[model samples]
Target chain A: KPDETPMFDPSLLKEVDWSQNTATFSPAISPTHPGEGLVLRPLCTADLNRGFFKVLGQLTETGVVSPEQFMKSFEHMKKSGDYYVTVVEDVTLGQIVATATLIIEHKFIHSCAKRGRVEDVVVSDECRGKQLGKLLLSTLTLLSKKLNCYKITLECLPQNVGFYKKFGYTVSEENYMCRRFL
Target chain B: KPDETPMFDPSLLKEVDWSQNTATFSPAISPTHPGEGLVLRPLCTADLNRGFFKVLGQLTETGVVSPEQFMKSFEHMKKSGDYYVTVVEDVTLGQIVATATLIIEHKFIHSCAKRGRVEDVVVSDECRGKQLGKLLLSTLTLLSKKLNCYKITLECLPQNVGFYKKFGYTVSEENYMCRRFL
Candidate 1:
């Protein structure tokens, strides 16, 4: 089913202004319903204890992701941020998928919205090839208007740069480095 | 001030056997310096996003601890699931704070690892008492024994519930009914 239609109703979109303190987001589509057994929306607490965990496990064991610094980093993100989600449900088929967290931090410094620092983007293997990935990235991009973020950013394994380009994200020629103390 | 000490280690704890599946929990504690900040591992990919939206924000705005239903629950917890960190840096007043996460079915559930469901956990106007909250819960409880819990679980209303009873959970005797849309 070639992804068609606006999927989101602009007329039904609500205005949430953080009053310059926060920007207003235009929800062309909420992504909560992608038809074809998939849904997307802002993640909530209950799902953390149930569905989220299941999907994360699969993502990690498959070696597509890692589990370092995430607990703390994620905790901090949750403490000061919010994320959009992509979920699919098929109880009888036992098919379920989850995609990453792309958060917005419109703080004073970092100036990420202008420079691209919105991190954390992922998707479970089961839902890999499906348009679900495209839908999630597109959803976040649309949601970013509310945070005044022009660029939707994430760190990808150096090998997957081309994969992201398929979604229209251009990679920089500069090298990003990190140092962790064990 | 330094971090606190743990009564048990998550790795050494007995596992929870749930039918065909088995689960276990372990707390991340500093072996040499026990009184360091304790970190509860992460669970689902959406835990951070969900935690903040469901745990923190909901606590502040609604006065109730409500969880959101997300399809991708376990995504965030995978990374922090095995992590149990307790370190005290210069910023946190050099105090060893609390942290704990529950593991079940490859997921980690979290709870009062810091601050509280306390309506006044933060100080918009007054410096609220930090005597007890999510941090305190991690500091005071023998949480490693609660097996098969991927995400730590704690729900409360900031408005009331006076002191959270210190022991034994408050149960609602009233009928709780539900209707599902999906």
Candidate 2:
């Protein structure tokens, strides 16, 4: 299918001032479903018990990551402009329902190109069919492009392939393999 | 093709004590061409001017990464057990001739699996045809596997596909694309 112009102006996402506590939107006004109040912002320490991991656990098999471990990871991520974690919140409940991560790596090839990878994309079961995934990924793509990344890549299960295709992703010919130690 | 037992015992690679300046090797020794007097070890700060970047630049289009920046990157890398930069040295010339990197990422899925990426596999143009690239990648694979990564991946030019296949990599069906910002 030909790529359609995004429903919302890309600039709206670009205009977001991340330093603000919340970028508010109304039911049907943002990526959330009708009648839902939403806020888009960076994942913060307060999200530890506010349904961040709960929503993620519903999408994938995740173990309990302790507050200390989570904070350690967050600290390392904060140190690099290369790592970004964006969360979608239910403004009324103050719960995170969707999230996505953008990780950029500096490389010496392609004339010192920076490559971006989209990862940890998840939307709560209740939030499915709300187009929040589209908002999360689209926002990430926009930010990566703004960062001047030479390319963005992602891997998904076969069933999720068609969903990502809507974002201009096509299948490539390269093998993903593993040699586990434990 | 079914994976064959590696020509060298995987244990040999594991038995290596990295603290010792250079790990001993033969065909029977180190991961190097016999009679070349080469040593394979984790890159150190001392390598910044020991022709490390010179060898890398010869293999790819790399701008000079300043010592300050290189040291900073190296320091951060050391803080995390997740990043490893392995370099092959021409012990005879006291210069680095080949290099590769293994970067492991902690993930929320697959029982908190760590994903590994093999990157920057390069050999000095003058050092090519000696199987340096093979040794570099093979050693990296061994280390990544030991790191308990659930999966390992890489991207290469179309022309280099056959080269990596020899290391037990199969082509995967996922598109890889980039959009340059600079």
Candidate 3:
């Protein structure tokens, strides 16, 4: 139809303040290094030079990324808006020490309440002894609730499932499956 | 640290065409009901009146929603652009018989390529036995490949694990985890 009755007002969703931009990352989190200045925030284009991919290398194959390449992907990620690539920076060193992403998915189910997908969580090998992983997980988890996500989900290796369980994550009736591209 | 040398140009990512708007859904797939006039396409705002939520009720808890509520979420989904909530509609019957969603994620891992998340796949009770689920899975899987997703993932109950194997879905070292809210 041609939107006969007045369509749903987006201003109403605005009142709920579901925007990822509203998120304020936890400030109390920090590395063990006494002088390290910690700032948990969304990944920015500037992060390319701040060792963002260096930290991601601790998770998987990030491959060779030049500035031209990083900015290109960064633009797509920035425009997409739903891509919440949160990162933790050691401002003292100007390096991203930990990172995680929570993608908010708007759904028709659950009364259209958004859902959260926690992805690519990695704490730098140099930063791991300090519970940065724990700090990042709880930070993302807390954001999911603030965004009103009905559920937050992720996939982890069995070796690490026990660690997630400590944070209220449980293996449900659901199981993981994947198909890869060359 | 200003734009010292230069910035990542977005044109390179454009060559990848990682846009959902680029997807051309499988035209050959259809419902088993003869003369149902099946049409498989991305979910549209108009679907609200066409038994969209009616089919959603089969999968989970979707409380009573008026047109106002439906439009609010629809606008957010549209503006965000990362959402790919596809549906199979029997145009002849003018009712949504099945629905599935693919949330594309941009990650620094795996060469900054995208990832796909298959969520909330459901076929109405009246629409079962036709393998519409198969059609939906393959359709989304096909779109994911075209969108240059490095991998696509989903979750299913133990009983359905064998069923997914028909489509190259397998259990890996990775496992599923979730936390829900009221």
Candidate 4:
């Protein structure tokens, strides 16, 4: 079997229920309305065709990815499970304008509890001025709590610290360190 | 399986390569070394009874766990297929004195390449002041590279910033932000 071929069935992919929240975190903004015809929800497989890559590129370089290769990653992550990739869509433009991911990680230290890590958050150039960033963060906080995460963490540039702090996230002594190749 | 060493069927777990880069990270640190009694290797399912939990508790509250429940998480994470939990064992003492976890994460960006997150790093009280922490981080860095990750990130306290920096890890404008429920 190809490595991309899931060891387990991808049809079993599960997502946290989006309908269950919106009341707790920024109730005013929701899946249906950050503006007219805009919706927020879990990323769909076909999103690769909907300009998901372009929006994410606003955050960092996203190498050229072909459709077949895209499905490989999608299938792999789906099989591995607990991956939450959320996106905001511009229905009128048929494009994904904002994106963020929350990965629920299980830990032995917390009595088998889960923790959330928010990564690769970006809003496309066209969607910059709206409170889409806040909306995305709020939504994930709600989802993190709903999933019973003992804690939720995100690493971001200093300029954005104040913004996330407004959402009840506190700065920790923990600084983000990384080594990147390519 | 109950009386066996590995709590789960080894066939269910993913091992990138058990001996992939054991000697590369810390050239002097090996399966036998420091005192000719220390070993570095992937976490064993048998480690629950080998002081893995106690050493991990030195980091934070572990909320008390039963061995049966411990295996529940082991099975779940093993099935997830992307967890890399490494440990340093003191053969003389029959205990796991150091541990660091590398969670290989899939993303929608970066052409769907994986990124590694280093978590739950801790060295037992008896093992502190030695280079065990460095050995564990070095080991994971090598493992991360071998696993084909484009980048590896870790969030750590300010006091230890310089320690990781010495290993070529640079701080980003990205500071760690977190919200804790407990």
Candidate 5:
């Protein structure tokens, strides 16, 4: 099956299929093997302080992360446990490669509008275009759909339209505007 | 002119004629007296500490505001100046009967999406169905346009979708899904 095809149920979407999708993070969980793995794991509030700031620092320079106003979004995600991180086998490096946060929210006024957003998406510069973005989004979408969310949405840099398009998101044609109240 | 007529801008095709549009909070902002004799103004960060909290409280109870995470939104709005509130003569027990906040954001990749969520809406309980919603929304649309936003979106209670339809919003069959990282 084409890697891009969305399955009726996420469980049936086939395995990670790393051959077609190469940019994956192997978990560093092998105590016996040292730095030989990368795993995509759900994040916690505690992890924000532990891992996010470093990756976010790199992301903010790229406009992937906005300003301090978005500080609360982290909390928003924290409350839901939908956030995920890809840690390499070396947690000791202080050099994490990628991190992504997923959100499941009920858009009021319409039940069908229940949805998801992937925010603070980041992958190391050395790993760009290797399909890591695809992997993270597919993982989030798969799990989100599995959890029964009705719809999913996210915003990206005006330049990344093609990147997200590859994932089947019908993005719009205007520059995004963002604000944070005092 | 009929209320259905669009104003000078073709893009404002959905715009309705104010003269014919009934507005509860409208004696139409003149220094004119028989009006409520209070000012309806753009809310600033300062207002967040004042009337803003009260209006948010109402939205929370009404489910118009997203759950716990809306607090970040409140702080976010404080900076954008997209938040608005109306003030009446407090000695006369005049107060804000309605409030709305519009955030300019990019979604679905590059699409311009303005999100408006409001609360209270009732100048008074008996004031229901009296154009309070329309009045607030019209004012909000003007503000959004001033900010160069092309699309404005809001969620109305399912039963009230018909009411919003009168305001030119099409009902969306799609549901919104949200998942947060913890």
Candidate 6:
């Protein structure tokens, strides 16, 4: 079945103006795939390609949301400067190959320090051997620091722990718990 | 210097009616400390006691926000059902002694499953030996489950890891990193 159309026009929705909000990061260099025009930047409304959704599906191993649902959520995210979803775009291929998101929270404690959480990090299987994930993370780390966050945290699979350690991330002693409702 | 007066009335803000929103947890048992009656419930606007803020400061070891700032944020949080802040009240003392917050995030993936994060857990030093922290966690866990969350996560000091282990939590291998701007 087709997805229900949203009442509002998503194109009219606001989006992050990277020129002002982003951190400077060195572009990814692929020695073997050297000639590819790899650029890293924040996701914009125009980046909502069907291919992008497919990549996300493969990375998350979950069904993609309807276009209307995606746009509605995207609109909300666009207005909130607290969330930054960065992606590695292959200019030649015209698709997003890797992505990592940073969600900042404003808090009262710690002298009103802002806290950040990194989530939904993934790289396309075809692009895996390259360091796209690393590129995205380094950029996110820089952005979090620029945002004046007191701390930034993230969770990853056991096998991926070493990958993050390269970025100076240490494992926290706290236990992670979950209670499934559905 | 005195804090600026909030433009809006905090008391007029809506709060979580615990009579309907809370989980089944006996308020507080103080048979021996009988007259010290303790109450465990969701934080309401009226509970903005200077005493409550003081206790939170003690728990977080950080500076507390001005009443005006607190009320403004409180009003914002009151309207969002995604956030639930549960506090322990020392009825006799007329102050909040402990608190744990649950933040639920709505996601489009995983069939639109909801995820939760538990944060800012602390108990006043005076109430430490009373398992108030445990009470707050247990209630938050229960509430998260009721909210149809797919999972809940939290971060704590390395020293506090063992304490959380008792609750079905396992240490994740993921890295925790921070680049403080302030």
Q: Which candidate leads in TM-score?
A: 4
The model with the greater lDDT, 1 or 3, is 3
lDDT of 2 by residue, B1-182 (tens): 21222222334454543332122333444443323687776777788667877777765676756656666656566565556777777888888888887876766566546788888878888885566777666667656666677667887767667766655565565545433333
- Report fnat in order of the candidates: 0.00, 0.34, 0.86, 0.89, 0.03, 0.54
Alpha carbon RMSD to native, model 2: 9.8
Worst 10 residues of 3 chain B by lDDT: B1-10
Name the better of 2 and 5 by lDDT.
Answer: 2
Segments of candidate 3 deviating more than 4 angstroms: A1-35, B1-36
Q: How many clashing residue pairs appear in each of the predictions shown?
A: 60, 15, 1, 0, 41, 0
- In the range B61-90, model 1's lDDT, one tens digit per residue, is 423322332212222222323323221121
| Model 6 chain B weakest 10-residue run by lDDT | B9-18
What is the per-residue lDDT of model 6 for residues B27-115, given as tens digits with 9 covering 90 to 100? 54321221247766667656665355666687565575676776666655545445677677777777778877787665545754568
Can you write out model 4's per-residue Cα lDDT over A96-121, one digit (the tens) per residue?
99988778898988787899988888
Candidate 3 lDDT, B55-124, residue by residue in tens: 8888998987767787777666656556677778788888889888777777767677888878888899
Docking tier of model 5: it is: incorrect
Candidate 2 wrong stretches, greater than 4 Å: A1-36, A64-69, A79-81, A109-113, A157-182, B1-26, B31-35, B45-48, B64-81, B157-178
User: Which wins on lDDT, candidate 3 or candidate 5?
Assistant: 3
Could you say which candidate leads in lDDT? Answer: 4
Per-candidate iRMS values, in order, are 20.6, 4.1, 1.6, 1.5, 12.1, 3.2
Point out where model 6 deviates above 4 Å: A1-39, A45-48, B1-39, B44-48, B72-81, B129-131, B157-168, B173-182
The top-ranked prediction according to DockQ is 4
Residue B177, model 4, lDDT: 87
> Please, what are the lDDT tens digits per residue for candidate 5 over residues A82-156?
333332212554345566655444322232133466666777676554445566776666555655566566665
Error of 4 at B182 (Å): 5.5
**The CA-based lDDT of model 2 is what?**
0.64
DockQ of each: 0.02, 0.27, 0.54, 0.69, 0.06, 0.42
Ordered from best to worst lDDT, the candidate numbers read 4, 3, 2, 6, 5, 1
Q: Model 5, B62-145: lDDT tens per residue?
A: 334433343443333333333333322222444444454343332211121233433234343433544445655655555455
**Native contact share for candidate 6:** 0.54
Candidate 4 docking band: medium
